[PDB]
Amino acid sequence: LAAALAQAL
Numbered sequence: 846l847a848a849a850l851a852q853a854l
């Protein structure tokens with residue numbers, strides 16, 4: 846999940 850969201854940054 847972390848990667849899925851982190852892509853924003």
Ligand SMILES: CC(C)(C)c1ccccc1
Nearest residue numbers: 846847848850851852854
């Ligand atoms: C630790 C998080 C998931 C916030 C992150 C990892 C790698 C690049 C950007 C964010």
Ligand SMILES: CC(C)(C)c1ccccc1
Nearest residue numbers: 847848849851852853854
């Ligand atoms: C340090 C960066 C943000 C390049 C990173 C750490 C862990 C996973 C993916 C990227």
